[PDB]
């Protein structure tokens, strides 16, 4: 059963095993069961850890339900794949990726006075091809002041760095004037409309190029896994795979009583139903209850 | 879909575009008589303007019945399509069995016939492993778990470098 | 036997979801007993 904080996370979720846990919970509440009071407890560090591990139970069956657009031509399979992961972010409680990674910046650098310590605590989230181009330009503005460039904004020594880092950001290809004019806004709704149409033209060309770089790495991983496997004789392949299949079954049979190992071996019985339901009618496929 | 849709019997398709199925509607004032002809069968019913609006009240919401998952079957479909590009170049292999006769055995150098019989045994090694298509499903499970861990990002499932770089300039080139 | 369901057949199979649940069922009740008992 679910712990009533999982089932609040699975309401806007749309995978199968989470909706049938919701639907049997809503069928219990139709038969007069009391909805248990959700906890007004679990302080700021424990609340961010439950949100970390309940979002990952919405993301994990959702990622396995998104077909990769491997070996497709065009942007719309890559835009479908990116839109399904956007919607998986919203179903799991994430915001927009722009609003969720900039929250990661301002959280990791809450205590930063100099921008060299910004550029070292946001190292995991910024590309090293871009972290280096902001560190080389930093040491030139460090050469003009011969004092550490501050994370102040009011400082004029930062204002000449922010005009040099804007020259770096346009060199990568990303419009730093359009990005800044979106998250700041404007007064009228007509001049803010044209900059949102120009941010979302960058943003869609941004997240497509992250999805397409993810597809081009799965395509390159699968093509090197296959070409290594096609160089084996077929007798080696069948026993390398039967050794890997049997070792991975035994790890789920060593684990007794665990919920994951009970569900692992129950899905092995559901794959063998799929192979057996196809053998009865192969022009029809698997037989669904209809 | 959304909850309320607003299409049906207004700017509708009035005729089919292929020859495999023949479509005719009878645009009356209230209702419409459809004439559908597909193969040997014909159907001629009557659909109101408010009969198509109740169609999108209950949604179909199709979903895929996969053997393991939709992710895995999309990787295995790519390994099956990659294994075709290798099979198509084993289709272009020269028929070495046309040189198996003893008028090629005895004209040939005895070491260039060991190599010819080894290059024929090699083709059966390559061909019997490229048609081992039951091994492509376990190869797709070597791609899945490393991909699925990159999607368990603490930032976002759809985050990447280009977005997180472009959202650094909003963080850096704003004040503190 | 035959003809399972549709909502039984829409489940992704070898997802984690239950290692993530088994970890959070042994990390969240084990860390509430860390902040309730914490002095440096």
């Amino acid at each position: 059963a679910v712990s009533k904080k999982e089932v609040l996370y699975f309401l806007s979720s749309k995978d199968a095993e989470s909706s049938t846990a919701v639907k049997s919970y809503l069928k219990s509440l139709y038969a007069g069961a009391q909805v248990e009071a959700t906890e007004t407890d679990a302080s700021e560090l424990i609340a961010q850890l439950e949100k970390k591990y309940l979002s990952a139970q919405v993301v994990e069956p959702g990622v396995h339900n998104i077909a990769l657009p491997l070996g497709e031509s065009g942007s719309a399979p890559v835009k479908r794949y990116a839109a399904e992961l956007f919607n998986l972010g919203a179903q799991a409680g994430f915001e927009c990726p722009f609003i969720e990674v900039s929250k990661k910046f301002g959280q990791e650098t809450a205590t930063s006075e100099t921008v060299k310590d910004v550029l070292n605590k946001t190292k995991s989230y910024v590309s090293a091809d871009y972290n280096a181009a902001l560190n080389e330009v930093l040491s030139s503005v460090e050469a003009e002041i011969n004092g550490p460039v501050l994370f102040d904004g009011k400082t004029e020594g930062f204002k000449k760095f922010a005009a040099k880092a804007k020259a770096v950001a346009v060199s990568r290809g990303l419009p730093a004037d359009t990005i800044l004019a979106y998250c700041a806004g404007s007064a009228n709704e007509d001049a803010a409309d044209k900059v949102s149409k120009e941010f979302f033209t960058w943003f869609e060309s941004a997240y497509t190029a992250d999805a397409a770089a993810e597809v081009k790495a799965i395509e390159a991983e699968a093509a090197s896994i296959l070409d290594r496997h096609l160089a084996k004789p077929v007798a080696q392949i069948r026993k390398e795979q039967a050794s890997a299949y049997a070792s991975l079954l035994k790890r789920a049979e060593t684990a007794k009583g665990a919920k994951w190992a009970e569900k692992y071996l129950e899905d092995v019985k559901a794959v063998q139903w799929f192979d057996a339901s196809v053998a009865e009618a192969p022009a029809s496929g698997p037989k669904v209850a209809a | 879909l959304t909850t309320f849709t607003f299409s049906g019997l207004q700017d509708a398709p009035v005729a089919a575009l292929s020859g495999s199925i023949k479509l005719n509607v009878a645009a009356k004032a209230g209702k419409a008589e459809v004439t559908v002809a597909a193969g040997a069968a014909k159907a001629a019913t009557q659909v109101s303007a408010a009969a198509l609006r109740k169609l999108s009240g209950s949604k179909i919401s199709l979903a895929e019945v996969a053997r393991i998952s939709v992710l895995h079957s999309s990787i295995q479909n790519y390994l099956l399509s990659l294994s075709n590009e290798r099979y198509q170049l084993l289709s272009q292999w020269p028929d070495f069995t046309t040189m198996y006769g003893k008028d090629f055995y005895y004209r040939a150098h005895p070491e260039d016939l060991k190599k010819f019989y080894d290059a024929a045994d090699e083709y059966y090694k390559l061909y019997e492993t490229v048609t081992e298509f039951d091994s492509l499903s376990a190869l797709a499970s070597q791609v899945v778990p490393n991909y699925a861990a990159r999607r368990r990002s603490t930032v976002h499932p759809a985050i990447g470098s280009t977005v997180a770089d472009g959202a650094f300039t909003n963080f850096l080139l704003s004040k503190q | 036997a035959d003809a399972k369901a549709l909502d039984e057949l829409r489940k992704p199979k070898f997802s984690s979801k239950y290692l993530i649940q088994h970890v959070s069922q042994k990390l969240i009740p084990a860390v509430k007993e860390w902040e309730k008992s914490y002095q440096p």
Partner: peptide, 30 residues
């Protein structure tokens, strides 16, 4: 066909490590 179950998160936002082209099309053309 079954995979090892992993429960670990990705903290870095990196490039996805495009692997190198194997020479199997060039080896089999040889």
């Amino acid at each position: 066909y079954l995979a090892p179950l992993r429960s670990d998160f990705t903290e870095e936002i990196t490039a996805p490590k495009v692997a190198s082209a194997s020479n199997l099309v060039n080896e089999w053309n040889n």
